[PDB]
Amino acid sequence: MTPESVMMMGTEAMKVALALAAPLLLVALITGLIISILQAATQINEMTLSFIPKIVAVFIAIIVAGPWMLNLLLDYVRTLFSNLPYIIG
Amino acid sequence: MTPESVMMMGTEAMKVALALAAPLLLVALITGLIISILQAATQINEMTLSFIPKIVAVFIAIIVAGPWMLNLLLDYVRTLFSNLPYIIG
Amino acid sequence: MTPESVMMMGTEAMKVALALAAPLLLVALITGLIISILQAATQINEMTLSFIPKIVAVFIAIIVAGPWMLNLLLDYVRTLFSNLPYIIG
Amino acid sequence: MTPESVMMMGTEAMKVALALAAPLLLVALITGLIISILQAATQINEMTLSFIPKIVAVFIAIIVAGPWMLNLLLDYVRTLFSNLPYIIG
Amino acid sequence: QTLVFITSLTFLPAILLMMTSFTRIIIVFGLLRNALGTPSAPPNQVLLGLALFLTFFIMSPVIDKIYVDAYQPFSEQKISMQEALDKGAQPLRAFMLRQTREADLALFARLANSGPLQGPEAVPMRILLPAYVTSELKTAFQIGFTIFIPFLIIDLVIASVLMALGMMMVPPATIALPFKLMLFVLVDGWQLLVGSLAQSFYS
Amino acid sequence: QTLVFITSLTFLPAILLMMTSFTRIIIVFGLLRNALGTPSAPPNQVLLGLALFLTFFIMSPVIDKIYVDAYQPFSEQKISMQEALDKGAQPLRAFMLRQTREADLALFARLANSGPLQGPEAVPMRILLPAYVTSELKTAFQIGFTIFIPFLIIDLVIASVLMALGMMMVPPATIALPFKLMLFVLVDGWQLLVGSLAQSFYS
Amino acid sequence: QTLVFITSLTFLPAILLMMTSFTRIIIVFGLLRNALGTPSAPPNQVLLGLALFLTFFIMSPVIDKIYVDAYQPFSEQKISMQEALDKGAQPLRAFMLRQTREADLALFARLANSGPLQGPEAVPMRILLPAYVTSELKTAFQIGFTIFIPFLIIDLVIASVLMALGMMMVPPATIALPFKLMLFVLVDGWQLLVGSLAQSFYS
Amino acid sequence: QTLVFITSLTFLPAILLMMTSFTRIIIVFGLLRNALGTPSAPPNQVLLGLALFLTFFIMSPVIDKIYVDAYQPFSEQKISMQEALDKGAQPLRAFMLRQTREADLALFARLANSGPLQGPEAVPMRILLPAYVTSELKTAFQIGFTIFIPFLIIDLVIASVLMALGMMMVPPATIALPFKLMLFVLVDGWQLLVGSLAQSFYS
Amino acid sequence: QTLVFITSLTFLPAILLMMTSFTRIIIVFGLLRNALGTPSAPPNQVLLGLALFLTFFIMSPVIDKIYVDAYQPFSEQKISMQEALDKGAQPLRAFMLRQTREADLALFARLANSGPLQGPEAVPMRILLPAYVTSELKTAFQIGFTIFIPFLIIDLVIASVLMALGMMMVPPATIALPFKLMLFVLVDGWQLLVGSLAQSFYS
Amino acid sequence: TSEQWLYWLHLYFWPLLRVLALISTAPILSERAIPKRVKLGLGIMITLVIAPSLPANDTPLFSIAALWLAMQQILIGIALGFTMQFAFAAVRTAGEFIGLQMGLSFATFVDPGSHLNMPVLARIMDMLAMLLFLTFNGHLWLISLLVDTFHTLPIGSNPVNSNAFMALARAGGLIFLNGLMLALPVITLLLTLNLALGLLNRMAPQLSIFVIGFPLTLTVGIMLMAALMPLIAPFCEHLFSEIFNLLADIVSEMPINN
């Protein structure tokens, strides 16, 4: 039960979270960036606008990425329930 | 059980809280400040935007800072359970 | 047990509450006011922003004010346990 | 024990509740309305803001209104314990 | 033979308190403490206490007529209790018959499919009891629920006042309990109560 | 007989402690622990210890007068309960009568339509007990409301501070426990209570 | 003596436990599970286990001073009355004394207006008990306030951060709990708790 | 000795189940549902059912060894609490040490001011319980933290997705429940739970 | 018997329900109300009733076998208490076994370390129970997620519509609720839910 | 005394258990505010009225296989209670979904402390309806129904049927209906308000609803609870009546289908 091990926990987990959430919000970014640029150059600025495209993109994302993302969790979750009798010591 | 001692409690603890939470939200500030400035000078103002970078920064923070922050608590917590028989008197 | 006395109870207590909570939230006000003004004049408007300064101010407040605030309660609380045998009548 | 009488119960009571709670929240309304308008016209929009004034108003309210509100309850409560032997029949 | 004996312990005295009053009383107070949040009162100790006291107050004249008519002549143990039992029931009979509704009377006389009854005393001990209980319950709740509504409306006023401010987090039930207390004592209301149960019982 | 014996053995232990004191005390603590959140102190055990003890110190002198007055001649068992109940009830009587409101007396007696009342012991027990218990309740809840005020001061101050800036989601109930936990000990007040109930008991 | 005996069957155990320790034990945990959210550990099950066991470990020397000094000659069952209670209470006396504040003594005995006081055995039971208690409660709430501070720190931090992010939506109290769990277990302090109650116990 | 008898009946079985297992079990499950929202599973029934069963399986070899050790000579009801105690504790002890952190024993052996410590029974009865229980708590909370992480992960995710989309006002902690649901179900890990608490319990 | 007897009286009505069904049924309901906000039913009251009604409705034929297969032949002659247990047990066994997973079998049979098995019914009584329970949990949560979907759809839809118009400010959590109830009732599906539970039990 | 008349009393246990089931199964009718020793009285009360003249003689055989018989009786008792409370539950769900638009629902998040906001409104409706019985009969119509069940379903041997249950396990159903029927006009209004708060935003993005909307809609939510009170009193008796038709049917249905 070293604080070192306890650190290794977070080191892994937070990287897992990186793996999951990374693509989605990136596509969100790129979307709002591009449309928001088009909000200039014949300005035409309202408010929400680019929101609606952002629902398309994320929706596509789970389609394209999908299963292997799951696999990630499926792996590590198991590994947890793997080492549990070694976590005591 | 002087009100003076009881004050010393808070004097220490609140400074501990200063130590912990200080860097993170500072980086948050600097982030939203800089991007928010870039929200001018070719304006391009949406809403959230700089939120996403702010998740990067904090995420990095625990990585960079990490263990010694823990040490802080690890120290003072113990010290508490140290003086407990003297806290009665 | 006149309704008049029962009114005097509240008349005192609510003023005590005035004494305690007054400075803190005032400083909160002034903070969000000033920063929020700076949210104009080179606009740069995000969302939270001025929140973080507001944690500084309140934190300072208990430092600066501190003990005498306590004294207030320390007084009146005692006075209560003072007159209790007269409260019956 | 007519359902008609049982209706008269509610008809009175709910109006009593009208009498009590009416002024307070009205002042709350007017407050948030006015400040919220001032949240436009040199916009300066944060979040809470007008909350703090709303604590002032309600606090004043019990001061200004006070006793006669009590009287209301004091009346009707008694009247209840008045007719109780007639409520059986 | 622990079984039959110690099981039979509870039954009989509970019945003996069922005969007359101590019922509607307990009920009303239980309903009280259901308002005002928690138990807030010592069930094991007090409210049982009250509910015994008020009874011993109200049933006093009857107990007198028995003591005269029964206990003291029972000092002889003259008859193994017959007119002790009977002639002691007759005051209980008339008293009982005061507040029993007719509905329960005819109804349960039907559930017995009984023949035409002349003497109300001829209505045996057995038929009197349940109708009695049911009816008086049907009074008990008629008062008890009419107690709450002011308390609960206070609750409405409270909750409204809070939520109007952005108070969303609180268990407002706790901020209630003091006011639910002041308006209990400030209006004197207690004496009003035991005056209600005092009179409207008998009338 | 034994039916009578165990019959009284069922209710009695509550009755005795009810007779006198300890009824205001309990209710006072019950109104306390609801301040400061959860059950906290374990009523299942502690309270009975506390409130039993304080009484035993308080009711002590009268109990002594019973010892010399009743227990001691009860050594002979010269007479059983004859002037034991009477004689020992006397300090019970005047005891209570000092502590009883006089409005409640005229109230309940007026309901019973009593004749001329001069002697306190000419006022029989059945007039005594209930009026007194009502007087206690009145007091107990009086002090009861007198308790809360500072605590509610705290809670409203905090709540105001939380909602002052953002933070609408925080559960104030936990942050407001510690301060309520200092102002209990910091002002020493836990002595101030028992001093208060102590003295203002008698008056 | 069926009556008095079985009544002491009702009260006795809670008293005997209150006579000793174990209260200051209980309240502490009772204030622990107030941190860490939900009832967590099974109050009806474990906390009683810990809290009792610690005691049986603690009082053990005095306990078997009662067995050796008391029950071993009680093989005779010499006198059911005197120095079982008295003598066996002598360690109850001292053990009860040394943990007690001094001021409460002057307070309570000051009330009872006793005469010359020298011997602690000349200070009777009924002077001891309440002071003993009020003392213990003082200590218990002391420690109780010593606890919470770090946890509070955690939640303040998380809340501040979230609200900074524009998380206003989020339920902060649901996130923190694991941190509160490790930062408790990481430091092993769970030992140090019973190290604290254990060492600090006597003095 | 009916006093001692029923006295023992009152608390006793809770103690008996503290003596073995099943504590860490329950604590774990009770720590499940705090992630995944509401009570969900019916704590009245299911959890205690599983939790009992697993214990039966686990202690089972020791159990039947006991039925041979105690109940089998108990054909004569041979000696009540003589070597039923010894023979009873031997597997109890050895298993217990097998589960017992050995630093704790240094602590309580130190504070106990012990003499020669050689046999496991030279570590007396009273010494085992507190340490062993503290241990069980330790591992319990350890596992407890091991659980939560993926769920927190999911929640941070969803929250981030919503914030990114401009969802600011949604109730995310409500929407996230089904996904937590599946990502527990999909993985079959519900087994691995009770494979873990099975193996890591003995080890 | 006495002791272990009363013990069995405590545990039994839990076991019998556990032994059969109804543990998977309730969770579906709790999952219901957790969509559509508040309790929206008396959890300890009605949703125990409905979920019992179904259970009897399903398991009925098994029962009718059990009686026709036991009492009526046990009344009169032939088997006594032996092939009673056999011939009445086996339908339970086979029934339960039908829905059991294949794996959890291997899991618990492995941990208990059972030798080569032949009769599936010869797989003993105790072993089946936990695997059964766990399995049925998995099923339960599955069914639950199948429940939620359309509602999540609802909230997403409405929230989206709001987002389209600049409604970011407004908390759609309120608006969706009457729709939830509408489009639950207009499509009558409550029937579809009780049936969907009825057939999909076994099929 | 001995055991002699004891066993004579020990005949009656079966209809007892039936009855005690009747009461405890009908709690909000006769509930936990009542001390458990009264709620155990009414059984021994009522049986001696009913129980005589009933032709039932049974014996507790070895390990009482007749315990199986008990599985019968309680059901019938249960059968009533968890039907009846529909009339209550349909009212409770009548109240709640109202205030959920108001101050009530902001407990939407996970596990706070206890159920909190429940008593706000729905506990008033809890009560009124529980009064409107005693205009007629709280327990009486029920008790009579039971009396009839002694004629239809005697005792012992082949116990029961099914498929009437799923009928009454169909039941609500209408729970949510009769919930709707009451609160329909309320809700249908308050949606309009909730949106009109929306329309302002395109004009006034900044109105931050907790600044404005709630201190408004709270009162209106109270007004509508004042004016829509009267429609209740004619309505409830639909609710009760229907269920009486049911129990008439069901109680009359299953026995002949044996």
Scanning every residue of chain C, which has its alpha carbon at the shortest distance from the alpha carbon of E188? C1
Can you tell me the distance from the alpha carbon of E177 to that of E151, in angstroms, rounded to the nearest whole number?
A: 10
Nearest to B72 by CA among B22, B6, B30: B22
Long-range contacts of J60-68 (CB under 8 A, 24+ apart): J63/I81, J65/I71, J65/I74, J65/I75, J66/J156, J68/I67, J68/I71, J68/J159
Q: Contacts of residue A50 in chain B, CB cutoff 8 Å?
A: 46
Residue E131, token pair as written in the block: 């109708």
Q: Please, are residues J179 and J86 in contact by the beta-carbon 8 Å criterion?
A: no
**G38: helix, strand or coil:** coil
Q: How many independent structural domains does chain J possess?
A: 1
Q: How far apart are CA G138 and CA I62, in angstroms?
A: 63
Distance CA J84, CA J79 (A): 9
Q: Measured between alpha carbons, how far is F12 from F6 in angstroms, rounded to an integer?
A: 10
- What DSSP string runs through I22-65? SHHHHHHHHHHHHSSSS--S-TTTHHHHHHHHHHHHHHHHHHHH
Closest C-alpha among D62, D67, D35 to residue D51 = D35
Q: Cβ contact (<8 Å) for H189 and A78?
A: yes
Chain E positions touching D81 (Cβ under 8 A) are 189, 192-193, 195-196
For residue F19, the chain E residue with the least C-alpha distance is: E49
Nearest residue of E to residue J29, measured between CA atoms:
E141
Asked if the bond preceding D89 is cis, omega within 30° of 0, the reply is no
Evaluate whether J225 touches J122 at the Cβ level (below 8 Å).
Answer: no
Task: Provide the 3-class DSSP secondary structure of residue J162.
Answer: coil
Q: Which residue from A25, A28, A39 is facing B44, i.e. has the nearest CB?
A: A39
Residues 5-24 of A with CB under 8 A from G: 6
Angle at I153 between CA I149 and CA I158, to 5 degrees: 155
**Nearest-CA neighbor of I189 among I157, I149, I160?**
I149
Q: Which of E87, E192, E105 is nearest to E147 (CA)?
A: E192
Residue of F nearest to C83 (CA): F196
Which residues of chain H neighbour J110 with C-beta distances below 8 Å?
37-38, 173-174
Token pair of I32 as six digits: 């219901």
Q: Alpha-carbon distance E138 to J134, whole Å?
A: 7
Measured CA to CA in angstroms, residue G58 lies from F197, G25, G139, G202, I189 at distances of 34, 11, 17, 9, 63
| C-alpha closest to that of E158 among E186, E183, E192, E141 | E183
Name the residue among I75, I162, E25, C33 with its Cα closest to residue J209. Answer: I162
The token pair at D22 is: 């009416």
Cα–Cα nearest to I135, from H194, A80, H29 = H194
Contact E104, J143 (CB under 8 A): no
Give Cβ neighbours of residue J161 (< 8 Å, ≥ 6 apart): J254, J257, J258
Q: State CA H61 to chain mean position distance.
A: 18
Q: At what angle do helices J122-132 and E125-165 cross, to 10 degrees?
A: 160
- Nearest CB among A7, A10, A37 relative to B44 is that of A37
Q: Do E182 and C1 touch (CB under 8 A)?
A: no
Q: What is the largest CA-CA distance in chain I?
A: 81
Do E30 and E145 meet the contact criterion of CB atoms below 8 Å apart?
Answer: no
- Resolution of the structure, angstroms: 4.2
And the tokens for I153?
């759809």
Spatial distance between the Cα atoms of J32 and E10, rounded to a whole number of angstroms: 18
Q: Considering only CA atoms, which of H43, H20, H14, H16 is closest in space to residue H31?
A: H43
- Spacing of C-alpha E169 from chain mean position: 40
Q: How many other C-beta atoms are found inside a 10 Å radius of the C-beta of residue I119?
A: 8
Distance CA I184, CA I177 (A): 11
Structure token digits, residue F134: 């009502």
Closest CA to I171 of H27, J214, E203, J81: J214
Instruction: State which amino acid sits at residue F141.
Output: F
J173 near D40, Cβ under 8 Å?
no
E-strand stretches of A6-50: none
Picking from B54, B60, B61, the residue whose alpha carbon sits closest to that of residue B23 is B61
* The two three-digit tokens of residue I181, written as one number: 């109830």
User: Which residue of chain C has the CA closest to E186?
Assistant: C3
Interchain CB distance below 8 Å, D88 and E164: no
Residue C57 touches partner D, C-beta closer than 8 Å? no
Query: Whole-angstrom Cα distance, residue I46 to residue I27?
Result: 14
Name the minimum distance, in Å, from the CA of I200 to any CA of chain J: 15
Query: Are C51 and G163 within 8 A, CB to CB?
Result: yes
Going by C-beta distance under 8 Å and a sequence separation of 6 or more, which residues neighbour residue I190? I184, J172, J173, J176
Rounded CA separation G55/G57 (Å)? 5
- Reported for G12-19, long-range contacts at CB under 8 A and 24+ positions apart, including other chains, are G13/H7, G14/F45, G14/F48, G14/F49, G15/F49, G15/F52, G17/F45, G17/G55, G18/F45, G18/F46, G18/F49, G18/G133, G19/G92, G19/G96
Q: Which amino acid is at E8?
A: S
Mutation choice for H interface testing from I33, I104, I145 by most H CBs within 10 A: I145
d(CA G154, CA I91): 56
Give CA–CA dist J43/J146, Å, rounded: 13
Q: Cα E140 to chain center, whole Å? A: 7
Output the six-digit token pair for E129: 């009891």
Residues in CB range of J75: below 8 A, 6 or more apart:
I56, J160
Does residue F6 contact residue E9 with C-beta atoms inside 8 Å? yes
Contact at CB, C3 and E185, closer than 8 angstroms? no
- Rounded CA-CA distance H86/J208 in Å is 72
**In whole angstroms, what is the distance from residue G55 CA to residue H129 CA?**
11
CB contact set of I94 (below 8 Å; sequence gap of 6+): I121
Technique of determination = cryo-EM
Q: Quote the minimal CA–CA distance from H152 to chain J in Å.
A: 14
Contact in structure between G107 and F147 (CB atoms under 8 Å): no
Distance CA J51, CA J44 (A): 10
What is the Cα gyration radius of chain I?
A: 23
- How does DSSP assign H91-102, residue by residue? HHHHHHHHHS-H
Alpha-helical regions (H) of I166-203? 176-185, 190-199
- Residue-level length of chain F: 203
**Max Cα-Cα span within chain H:** 78
- Three state DSSP letters for chain E: CCHHHHHHHHHHHHHHHHCCCCHHHHHHHHHHHHCCCCCCCCCCCHHHHHHHHHHHHHCHHHHHHHHHHCHHHHCCCCCCCCCCHHHHHHHHHHHHHHHCCHHHHHHHHHHCCCCCCCCCCCCCHHHHHHHHHHHHHHHHHHHHHHHHHHHHHHHHHHHHHHHHHCCCCCCCHHHHHHHHHHHHHCCCHHHHHHHHHHHHHHC
Q: Which of B85, E54, E81 is nearest to G193 (CA)?
A: B85
Q: Which chains touch J (3 or more CB pairs under 8 A)?
A: D, E, G, H, I
Distance CA A45, CA J53 (A): 89
**Nearest chain J residue (CA) to H176:** J110
Token pair of A7, please?
Answer: 């650190």
Q: Name the residue among D24, E167, H167 with its Cα closest to residue J210.
A: E167
Indicate the angle between helix axes D67-87 and E189-202, nearest 10 degrees: 10
- CB proximity under 8 Å: D 30-49 to F: 47-48
J73, J20 Cβ separation under 8 angstroms: no
Contact check, Cβ <8 Å, E27/J34: yes
Residues of I in contact with A52 (CB under 8 A): 164
List chains adjacent to chain D, taking adjacency as at least 3 C-beta pairs closer than 8 Å: C, E, F, J
Q: What number of other Cβ atoms are within 10 A of residue H33's Cβ?
A: 16
Closest residue by Cα to residue J213 from J235, J196, J230, J232: J196
Amino acid at I173: A
How far apart (Å, rounded) are the C-alpha atoms in residues C42 and C44?
A: 6
- CA distances (Å), H96 to each of C46, H83, H89, J224, J248, in order? 60, 19, 10, 66, 63
Match 């739970």 to its residue by tokens. Answer: H193
Considering only the beta carbons, identify the residue of F39, F56, F169 that sits closest to G170: F169
* 8 Å CB contact between H28 and H143: yes
CB-CB contact of H155 with H173 (8 Å): yes
CB contact under 8 A, E167 and F171: no
Provide the domain limits for residue J131: 1-258
Residue H125, SS3 per DSSP: helix
Against chain H, the chains showing at least 3 CB pairs within 8 Å are A, B, G, I, J
CB contact under 8 A, F164 and D48: yes
H172: left (phi over 0), alpha (psi -120 to 50) or beta: alpha
How many residues are listed for chain G in this entry?
A: 203
CB-CB contact of J90 with I24 (8 Å): no
Helix axes F190-202 and F46-58, enclosed angle (nearest 10): 40
CA angle H70, H76, H81 (to 5 degrees): 45
CA distance E193 to I5: 48
To test the contact with chain C by mutation, choose from E179, E183, E186, E190 the residue with the greatest count of C C-beta atoms within 10 A, namely: E186
H58 φ/ψ sector (left φ>0, alpha ψ -120 to 50, else beta): alpha
Only one residue has tokens 């008796």, namely J237
From G164, G193, G166, select the one nearest G35 (Cα to Cα): G193
Q: Which residues of J50-84 are buried (b: 16+ CB within 10 A; e: fewer)?
A: bbeebeeeeeeeeeebeeebeebbbbbbbbbbbbb
Structural domain that includes position F44: 2-58+99-202
The distance of Cα G170 from the centroid of its chain, to the nearest Å, equals 39
**In 10 A of CB I101, how many CB atoms?**
17
What whole-number distance in Å separates Cα of residue I144 and Cα of residue I122? Answer: 34
Cα–Cα dist B21/B5, whole Å: 25
Q: Which two tokens stand for residue B22?
A: 């200080």
Looking from the CA of J237 toward its CB, the CA atoms found within 13 Å total 9
Alpha carbons H121 and G130: distance in angstroms, whole number: 40
- Give F17's contacts in chain E (Cβ within 8 Å): 45
Q: How many structural domains does chain F have?
A: 1
**Positive or negative CA dihedral for A11, A16, A17, A18?**
positive
Q: How many CB pairs under 8 A join C and F?
A: 71
Count H helices, E strands: chain A? Answer: 3, 0
- Give the C-alpha distances (Å, rounded to integers) separating J257 from J150, J152, J153, J161, J167: 17, 12, 12, 8, 14
Non-local CB neighbours of F42 within 8 Å, separated by 6+ positions: G26, G27, G30
Q: Do B3 and C70 touch (CB under 8 A)?
A: yes
To test the contact with chain F by mutation, choose from E194, E197, E199, E200 the residue with the greatest count of F C-beta atoms within 10 A, namely: E194
- Please, which chains are in contact with A (at least 3 CB pairs closer than 8 A)? B, G, H, I
Give CA angle at C25 (C24, C31), nearest 5°. 100
Three-state SS string over G59-79 comes to CHHHHHHHHHHHHHHHCCCCC
> Number of helices and strands (H, E) in chain F?
10, 0
- Which of helix, strand or coil describes residue G200? helix
CB contact under 8 A, C13 and F203: no
Q: Give per-residue burial for F118-157: e unless 16+ CB within 10 Å, then b.
A: eeeeebeebbbbbbbbbbbbbbbbbbbbbbbbbbebbbbb
Residues 6+ apart with CB under 8 A from J48: E126
Q: What's the burial of A67, exposed, middle or buried (CB within 10 Å: 0-12/13-18/19+)?
A: exposed
| Residue J30 Rama label (left phi>0; alpha psi -120 to 50; beta) | beta
Distance (Å, rounded) from C-alpha F161 to C-alpha F176?
11
Locate H141 and state its tokens.
């909370």
Widest CA span in chain E: 77
What sign results for the dihedral spanned by CA atoms E183, E188, E193, E194?
Answer: positive
Instruction: Please indicate whether, in this complex, the C-beta atoms of B1 and F185 are within 8 angstroms of each other.
Output: yes
H11 contacts on G by Cβ (under 8 Å): 48
Interface-testing mutation among I5, I40, I155, with chain J (most J C-beta atoms within 10 A)? I40
Q: Please, how many CA atoms are within 13 Å of residue F79, restricted to the half-sphere of its CB?
A: 9
Is E53 within the bounds of a domain? yes
- Tell me if residue A12 falls in helix, strand or coil: helix
Q: Do I126 and I99 touch, CB atoms closer than 8 A?
A: no
